[PDB]
PDB file of C-alpha atoms and ligand atoms in Angstrom:
ATOM      1  CA  UNK A   1      -8.616  14.161  84.991  1.00 45.30           C
ATOM      2  CA  UNK A   2     -11.622  11.940  84.264  1.00 44.74           C
ATOM      3  CA  UNK A   3     -14.764  12.249  86.380  1.00 42.00           C
ATOM      4  CA  UNK A   4     -13.390  15.136  88.414  1.00 40.46           C
ATOM      5  CA  UNK A   5     -14.641  18.667  89.011  1.00 38.88           C
ATOM      6  CA  UNK A   6     -13.561  22.219  88.260  1.00 40.34           C
ATOM      7  CA  UNK A   7     -11.173  23.182  91.067  1.00 39.55           C
ATOM      8  CA  UNK A   8     -11.848  26.896  90.952  1.00 38.90           C
ATOM      9  CA  UNK A   9      -9.379  29.631  90.045  1.00 37.29           C
ATOM     10  CA  UNK A  10      -6.156  29.389  92.057  1.00 35.92           C
ATOM     11  CA  UNK A  11      -7.504  27.009  94.720  1.00 34.12           C
ATOM     12  CA  UNK A  12      -4.498  24.735  94.043  1.00 30.89           C
ATOM     13  CA  UNK A  13      -1.691  27.365  94.336  1.00 32.44           C
ATOM     14  CA  UNK A  14       1.140  24.824  93.997  1.00 31.44           C
ATOM     15  CA  UNK A  15      -0.078  23.426  90.657  1.00 29.40           C
ATOM     16  CA  UNK A  16       2.225  24.120  87.722  1.00 29.98           C
ATOM     17  CA  UNK A  17       1.890  23.675  83.962  1.00 31.12           C
ATOM     18  CA  UNK A  18       4.970  22.709  81.931  1.00 28.39           C
ATOM     19  CA  UNK A  19       4.833  24.430  78.543  1.00 26.46           C
ATOM     20  CA  UNK A  20       6.716  24.042  75.248  1.00 23.90           C
ATOM     21  CA  UNK A  21       4.366  25.884  72.908  1.00 26.16           C
ATOM     22  CA  UNK A  22       1.543  23.970  74.559  1.00 26.54           C
ATOM     23  CA  UNK A  23       0.733  22.300  77.883  1.00 28.82           C
ATOM     24  CA  UNK A  24       2.370  18.864  78.081  1.00 28.30           C
ATOM     25  CA  UNK A  25       2.700  18.047  81.802  1.00 25.93           C
ATOM     26  CA  UNK A  26       1.932  19.279  85.296  1.00 24.62           C
ATOM     27  CA  UNK A  27       4.186  19.819  88.285  1.00 26.42           C
ATOM     28  CA  UNK A  28       4.330  20.985  91.897  1.00 23.87           C
ATOM     29  CA  UNK A  29       6.051  24.040  93.323  1.00 23.20           C
ATOM     30  CA  UNK A  30       8.021  22.958  96.413  1.00 23.17           C
ATOM     31  CA  UNK A  31       9.853  26.268  97.033  1.00 20.46           C
ATOM     32  CA  UNK A  32      10.377  29.607  95.256  1.00 25.29           C
ATOM     33  CA  UNK A  33      12.890  28.097  92.809  1.00 23.91           C
ATOM     34  CA  UNK A  34      12.109  24.398  92.463  1.00 20.12           C
ATOM     35  CA  UNK A  35       9.377  22.307  90.883  1.00 17.13           C
ATOM     36  CA  UNK A  36       8.882  18.548  91.139  1.00 18.53           C
ATOM     37  CA  UNK A  37       7.407  16.616  88.208  1.00 17.20           C
ATOM     38  CA  UNK A  38       7.776  13.275  86.435  1.00 18.32           C
ATOM     39  CA  UNK A  39      10.992  12.151  84.771  1.00 18.55           C
ATOM     40  CA  UNK A  40       9.051  10.970  81.716  1.00 16.27           C
ATOM     41  CA  UNK A  41       7.994  14.604  81.250  1.00 16.27           C
ATOM     42  CA  UNK A  42      11.594  15.629  80.534  1.00 14.73           C
ATOM     43  CA  UNK A  43      12.217  17.815  77.507  1.00 14.03           C
ATOM     44  CA  UNK A  44      14.550  20.677  76.622  1.00 13.95           C
ATOM     45  CA  UNK A  45      13.150  24.202  76.334  1.00 15.02           C
ATOM     46  CA  UNK A  46      10.626  24.077  79.156  1.00 17.85           C
ATOM     47  CA  UNK A  47       8.712  27.120  80.362  1.00 15.02           C
ATOM     48  CA  UNK A  48       7.094  26.816  83.787  1.00 17.15           C
ATOM     49  CA  UNK A  49       3.712  28.485  84.186  1.00 16.96           C
ATOM     50  CA  UNK A  50       2.528  29.334  87.713  1.00 14.43           C
ATOM     51  CA  UNK A  51      -0.775  30.791  88.943  1.00 15.39           C
ATOM     52  CA  UNK A  52      -2.641  29.245  86.027  1.00 14.18           C
ATOM     53  CA  UNK A  53      -6.332  28.339  85.758  1.00 15.67           C
ATOM     54  CA  UNK A  54      -7.447  28.799  82.149  1.00 16.93           C
ATOM     55  CA  UNK A  55      -4.250  27.811  80.307  1.00 15.25           C
ATOM     56  CA  UNK A  56      -5.380  29.324  76.980  1.00 16.64           C
ATOM     57  CA  UNK A  57      -6.052  32.922  78.057  1.00 19.51           C
ATOM     58  CA  UNK A  58      -4.008  35.370  80.131  1.00 20.10           C
ATOM     59  CA  UNK A  59      -6.238  36.176  83.134  1.00 23.13           C
ATOM     60  CA  UNK A  60      -3.759  37.776  85.495  1.00 20.28           C
ATOM     61  CA  UNK A  61      -1.888  36.054  88.338  1.00 21.52           C
ATOM     62  CA  UNK A  62       0.240  33.999  85.939  1.00 20.58           C
ATOM     63  CA  UNK A  63       4.019  33.952  86.158  1.00 21.05           C
ATOM     64  CA  UNK A  64       5.949  32.495  83.222  1.00 24.00           C
ATOM     65  CA  UNK A  65       9.475  31.392  84.105  1.00 23.99           C
ATOM     66  CA  UNK A  66      11.957  29.461  81.974  1.00 28.18           C
ATOM     67  CA  UNK A  67      13.583  26.345  83.376  1.00 28.59           C
ATOM     68  CA  UNK A  68      17.315  26.807  83.939  1.00 29.97           C
ATOM     69  CA  UNK A  69      17.858  23.079  84.465  1.00 28.54           C
ATOM     70  CA  UNK A  70      15.974  19.794  84.692  1.00 28.50           C
ATOM     71  CA  UNK A  71      17.330  16.966  86.851  1.00 26.03           C
ATOM     72  CA  UNK A  72      15.902  13.533  85.995  1.00 26.28           C
ATOM     73  CA  UNK A  73      16.499  10.909  88.694  1.00 26.12           C
ATOM     74  CA  UNK A  74      19.738   9.013  87.852  1.00 27.64           C
ATOM     75  CA  UNK A  75      17.972   5.657  88.313  1.00 24.97           C
ATOM     76  CA  UNK A  76      14.907   6.510  86.228  1.00 25.07           C
ATOM     77  CA  UNK A  77      14.008   3.619  83.914  1.00 25.78           C
ATOM     78  CA  UNK A  78      11.875   4.558  80.910  1.00 24.47           C
ATOM     79  CA  UNK A  79      10.674   0.970  80.433  1.00 24.30           C
ATOM     80  CA  UNK A  80       9.222   0.349  83.896  1.00 23.06           C
ATOM     81  CA  UNK A  81       8.904   4.004  84.924  1.00 22.53           C
ATOM     82  CA  UNK A  82      10.568   3.152  88.222  1.00 22.93           C
ATOM     83  CA  UNK A  83      11.925   6.342  89.863  1.00 24.97           C
ATOM     84  CA  UNK A  84       9.678   8.537  87.694  1.00 26.32           C
ATOM     85  CA  UNK A  85      10.610  11.829  89.348  1.00 25.93           C
ATOM     86  CA  UNK A  86      12.367  14.978  88.147  1.00 26.69           C
ATOM     87  CA  UNK A  87      13.460  18.309  89.627  1.00 26.25           C
ATOM     88  CA  UNK A  88      13.287  21.566  87.683  1.00 28.21           C
ATOM     89  CA  UNK A  89      15.148  24.666  88.802  1.00 25.85           C
ATOM     90  CA  UNK A  90      13.586  27.977  87.786  1.00 23.33           C
ATOM     91  CA  UNK A  91      15.768  30.581  86.064  1.00 22.84           C
ATOM     92  CA  UNK A  92      14.382  33.131  88.543  1.00 22.36           C
ATOM     93  CA  UNK A  93      12.613  32.813  91.884  1.00 20.75           C
ATOM     94  CA  UNK A  94       8.832  32.823  91.656  1.00 21.68           C
ATOM     95  CA  UNK A  95       6.955  35.551  93.494  1.00 23.23           C
ATOM     96  CA  UNK A  96       5.024  33.705  96.193  1.00 24.83           C
ATOM     97  CA  UNK A  97       1.584  34.953  97.174  1.00 26.37           C
ATOM     98  CA  UNK A  98      -1.967  33.803  97.829  1.00 27.75           C
ATOM     99  CA  UNK A  99      -2.331  32.350  94.332  1.00 26.75           C
ATOM    100  CA  UNK A 100       1.207  30.972  93.968  1.00 29.97           C
ATOM    101  CA  UNK A 101       2.402  28.919  96.932  1.00 27.11           C
ATOM    102  CA  UNK A 102       4.611  25.917  97.642  1.00 26.95           C
ATOM    103  CA  UNK A 103       3.447  22.563  98.991  1.00 26.17           C
ATOM    104  CA  UNK A 104       5.237  20.734 101.820  1.00 26.18           C
ATOM    105  CA  UNK A 105       7.198  17.515 101.392  1.00 23.72           C
ATOM    106  CA  UNK A 106       6.082  14.523 103.509  1.00 24.77           C
ATOM    107  CA  UNK A 107       7.832  13.500 106.734  1.00 25.08           C
ATOM    108  CA  UNK A 108       6.277  10.030 106.561  1.00 26.36           C
ATOM    109  CA  UNK A 109       4.456   7.946 103.967  1.00 21.72           C
ATOM    110  CA  UNK A 110       0.663   7.899 103.735  1.00 21.11           C
ATOM    111  CA  UNK A 111      -1.296   4.724 104.448  1.00 16.40           C
ATOM    112  CA  UNK A 112      -4.085   2.986 102.545  1.00 14.84           C
ATOM    113  CA  UNK A 113      -7.457   4.669 102.881  1.00 13.70           C
ATOM    114  CA  UNK A 114      -5.950   8.156 103.050  1.00 12.76           C
ATOM    115  CA  UNK A 115      -7.922  10.621 100.929  1.00  9.32           C
ATOM    116  CA  UNK A 116      -5.921  12.795  98.510  1.00  7.95           C
ATOM    117  CA  UNK A 117      -6.400  15.561  95.959  1.00  7.79           C
ATOM    118  CA  UNK A 118      -5.152  15.039  92.391  1.00  9.40           C
ATOM    119  CA  UNK A 119      -5.295  17.842  89.820  1.00 10.06           C
ATOM    120  CA  UNK A 120      -4.298  18.736  86.267  1.00 12.52           C
ATOM    121  CA  UNK A 121      -5.238  19.905  82.762  1.00 12.00           C
ATOM    122  CA  UNK A 122      -5.135  16.410  81.272  1.00 12.10           C
ATOM    123  CA  UNK A 123      -7.659  14.454  79.208  1.00  9.01           C
ATOM    124  CA  UNK A 124     -11.133  14.338  80.759  1.00  7.82           C
ATOM    125  CA  UNK A 125     -12.505  11.397  78.747  1.00  8.39           C
ATOM    126  CA  UNK A 126     -12.012   7.647  79.189  1.00  9.67           C
ATOM    127  CA  UNK A 127     -12.610   7.196  75.464  1.00 10.74           C
ATOM    128  CA  UNK A 128     -11.495   9.790  72.953  1.00  8.06           C
ATOM    129  CA  UNK A 129      -9.734  13.062  73.708  1.00  7.04           C
ATOM    130  CA  UNK A 130     -10.928  16.305  75.287  1.00  2.58           C
ATOM    131  CA  UNK A 131      -8.609  18.758  77.016  1.00  5.32           C
ATOM    132  CA  UNK A 132     -10.044  21.356  79.427  1.00  7.29           C
ATOM    133  CA  UNK A 133      -9.199  25.055  79.596  1.00  7.08           C
ATOM    134  CA  UNK A 134      -9.393  25.231  83.384  1.00  8.74           C
ATOM    135  CA  UNK A 135      -7.811  23.161  86.164  1.00  7.61           C
ATOM    136  CA  UNK A 136      -9.636  19.976  87.182  1.00  7.74           C
ATOM    137  CA  UNK A 137      -9.697  18.300  90.610  1.00  9.74           C
ATOM    138  CA  UNK A 138     -10.325  14.778  91.923  1.00 11.30           C
ATOM    139  CA  UNK A 139     -10.361  13.372  95.442  1.00 10.80           C
ATOM    140  CA  UNK A 140      -9.078   9.805  95.571  1.00 11.38           C
ATOM    141  CA  UNK A 141      -8.021   7.337  98.273  1.00 12.01           C
ATOM    142  CA  UNK A 142      -4.694   5.503  98.365  1.00  8.50           C
ATOM    143  CA  UNK A 143      -5.299   1.788  97.803  1.00  7.08           C
ATOM    144  CA  UNK A 144      -3.752  -1.067  99.779  1.00  8.08           C
ATOM    145  CA  UNK A 145      -0.612  -2.674  98.363  1.00  9.33           C
ATOM    146  CA  UNK A 146      -2.290  -6.046  97.790  1.00  8.57           C
ATOM    147  CA  UNK A 147      -5.053  -4.520  95.660  1.00 12.35           C
ATOM    148  CA  UNK A 148      -2.483  -2.416  93.784  1.00 14.13           C
ATOM    149  CA  UNK A 149      -0.315  -5.384  92.817  1.00 14.20           C
ATOM    150  CA  UNK A 150      -3.319  -7.564  91.942  1.00 14.37           C
ATOM    151  CA  UNK A 151      -4.812  -5.027  89.530  1.00 12.97           C
ATOM    152  CA  UNK A 152      -1.652  -3.692  87.833  1.00 15.75           C
ATOM    153  CA  UNK A 153      -0.551  -5.346  84.579  1.00 13.40           C
ATOM    154  CA  UNK A 154       3.017  -4.020  84.633  1.00 15.25           C
ATOM    155  CA  UNK A 155       5.280  -4.370  87.673  1.00 15.01           C
ATOM    156  CA  UNK A 156       4.538  -2.111  90.635  1.00 18.55           C
ATOM    157  CA  UNK A 157       7.720  -1.287  92.553  1.00 20.21           C
ATOM    158  CA  UNK A 158       8.061  -0.074  96.145  1.00 18.79           C
ATOM    159  CA  UNK A 159       8.533   3.393  94.632  1.00 19.84           C
ATOM    160  CA  UNK A 160       4.930   3.424  93.423  1.00 23.93           C
ATOM    161  CA  UNK A 161       1.449   3.367  94.918  1.00 24.26           C
ATOM    162  CA  UNK A 162      -2.065   3.058  93.528  1.00 24.18           C
ATOM    163  CA  UNK A 163      -4.857   5.565  94.089  1.00 25.15           C
ATOM    164  CA  UNK A 164      -8.348   5.856  92.678  1.00 24.93           C
ATOM    165  CA  UNK A 165     -11.471   3.785  92.200  1.00 27.71           C
ATOM    166  CA  UNK A 166     -11.587   0.141  91.184  1.00 26.53           C
ATOM    167  CA  UNK A 167     -15.141   0.582  89.879  1.00 24.57           C
ATOM    168  CA  UNK A 168     -13.745   2.956  87.264  1.00 21.10           C
ATOM    169  CA  UNK A 169     -15.025   6.340  86.134  1.00 23.00           C
ATOM    170  CA  UNK A 170     -12.619   8.538  88.126  1.00 23.91           C
ATOM    171  CA  UNK A 171      -8.881   8.770  87.452  1.00 25.81           C
ATOM    172  CA  UNK A 172      -5.998  10.985  86.320  1.00 26.51           C
ATOM    173  CA  UNK A 173      -5.035  10.709  82.632  1.00 22.99           C
ATOM    174  CA  UNK A 174      -2.740  11.757  79.750  1.00 25.67           C
ATOM    175  CA  UNK A 175      -1.618  15.334  80.306  1.00 27.29           C
ATOM    176  CA  UNK A 176      -1.939  15.123  84.094  1.00 26.46           C
ATOM    177  CA  UNK A 177       1.487  13.450  84.250  1.00 28.55           C
ATOM    178  CA  UNK A 178       3.958  15.096  86.579  1.00 29.07           C
ATOM    179  CA  UNK A 179       1.060  16.557  88.559  1.00 28.22           C
ATOM    180  CA  UNK A 180       0.516  16.510  92.363  1.00 26.48           C
ATOM    181  CA  UNK A 181      -1.175  14.073  94.721  1.00 25.94           C
ATOM    182  CA  UNK A 182      -1.607  15.908  98.027  1.00 27.04           C
ATOM    183  CA  UNK A 183      -2.845  14.227 101.193  1.00 29.58           C
ATOM    184  CA  UNK A 184      -3.146  15.868 104.608  1.00 30.59           C
ATOM    185  CA  UNK A 185      -1.389  18.899 103.149  1.00 31.85           C
ATOM    186  CA  UNK A 186       1.697  16.963 102.043  1.00 31.82           C
ATOM    187  CA  UNK A 187       2.876  16.057  98.532  1.00 33.32           C
ATOM    188  CA  UNK A 188       2.686  12.247  98.610  1.00 31.96           C
ATOM    189  CA  UNK A 189       2.544  11.430  94.907  1.00 32.81           C
ATOM    190  CA  UNK A 190       3.290  12.407  91.312  1.00 34.29           C
ATOM    191  CA  UNK A 191       1.001  11.362  88.451  1.00 32.31           C
ATOM    192  CA  UNK A 192       3.083   8.710  86.674  1.00 34.67           C
ATOM    193  CA  UNK A 193       1.104   6.151  84.664  1.00 35.49           C
ATOM    194  CA  UNK A 194      -1.861   3.839  84.301  1.00 34.89           C
ATOM    195  CA  UNK A 195      -3.527   1.411  81.899  1.00 36.12           C
ATOM    196  CA  UNK A 196      -5.876   3.542  79.845  1.00 35.28           C
ATOM    197  CA  UNK A 197      -7.878   5.995  81.969  1.00 35.51           C
ATOM    198  CA  UNK A 198     -10.628   5.427  84.537  1.00 34.12           C
ATOM    199  CA  UNK A 199     -10.980   1.784  83.490  1.00 35.24           C
ATOM    200  CA  UNK A 200     -12.481  -0.849  85.783  1.00 35.45           C
ATOM    201  CA  UNK A 201      -9.904  -2.558  88.013  1.00 35.01           C
ATOM    202  CA  UNK A 202      -7.158  -0.355  86.558  1.00 35.41           C
ATOM    203  CA  UNK A 203      -6.299   2.339  89.138  1.00 36.36           C
ATOM    204  CA  UNK A 204      -3.759   5.080  88.550  1.00 37.15           C
ATOM    205  CA  UNK A 205      -0.151   4.500  89.547  1.00 34.87           C
ATOM    206  CA  UNK A 206       1.869   7.251  91.197  1.00 38.37           C
ATOM    207  CA  UNK A 207       5.446   7.937  92.243  1.00 36.95           C
ATOM    208  CA  UNK A 208       5.792   7.464  96.019  1.00 39.04           C
ATOM    209  CA  UNK A 209       7.344  10.802  97.041  1.00 39.22           C
ATOM    210  CA  UNK A 210       8.105   9.854 100.664  1.00 44.35           C
ATOM    211  CA  UNK A 211      10.917   7.598  99.362  1.00 45.35           C
ATOM    212  CA  UNK A 212      12.640  10.554  97.668  1.00 43.45           C
ATOM    213  CA  UNK A 213      12.653  13.257 100.352  1.00 41.07           C
ATOM    214  CA  UNK A 214      16.352  12.819 101.190  1.00 42.21           C
ATOM    215  CA  UNK A 215      17.277  12.822  97.507  1.00 44.08           C
ATOM    216  CA  UNK A 216      15.184  15.928  96.820  1.00 44.13           C
ATOM    217  CA  UNK A 217      16.822  17.841  99.664  1.00 45.82           C
ATOM    218  CA  UNK A 218      20.381  16.764  98.833  1.00 43.86           C
ATOM    219  CA  UNK A 219      19.958  17.581  95.146  1.00 39.26           C
ATOM    220  CA  UNK A 220      18.414  21.009  95.713  1.00 39.90           C
ATOM    221  CA  UNK A 221      21.092  21.858  98.290  1.00 41.01           C
ATOM    222  CA  UNK A 222      23.928  21.107  95.867  1.00 41.38           C
ATOM    223  CA  UNK A 223      22.477  22.971  92.870  1.00 42.12           C
TER     224      UNK A 223
HETATM  225 CA1   CA B   1      -4.026  31.725  82.010  1.00 43.91          CA
END
């Protein structure tokens, strides 16, 4: 997250960190046994870390659980990043509490102008690299479709939406991928991609979760 602020320990109870000897992506807990993240974050040997704040020190409240299976969307395209969504089933059910809670799936899509909260342990600099120890937060509005399509270099599909600031300075970034975009208490987006980070006229692009609710439910129910 670039230009964001320190969230505060466990204030984002649904935030997850995907780990393979190091933090490589974020995710969102949607129920005691399932996490939603980005398909481009797929990898074998994933350990899910819940209740995290400082990802480099054990502070208490953390729950480390191995992934028993990762389900990348069948129509995911690595070239365009269309359908950049993945479901991870935990080997064991997480112990839900005040610091580890699930986030609700949307019943309808969010409209332009809606304010949302994006979070993660990704790069905090537009130029160069600097990874934080603690979870970062950023409030950003969903942009209109016309502005989204006019500013994006690559193709923006109906399964994506833009969020952020056209003036630059505030955006999600490398390492935040797979993370949550929550608006009105519902998970509306997944950090997917962008052109650089916090650049002028280059807002972040996210996976539009409201288009995958049925798929999420059907997949979880049959696994
Ligand atoms: Ca920790």
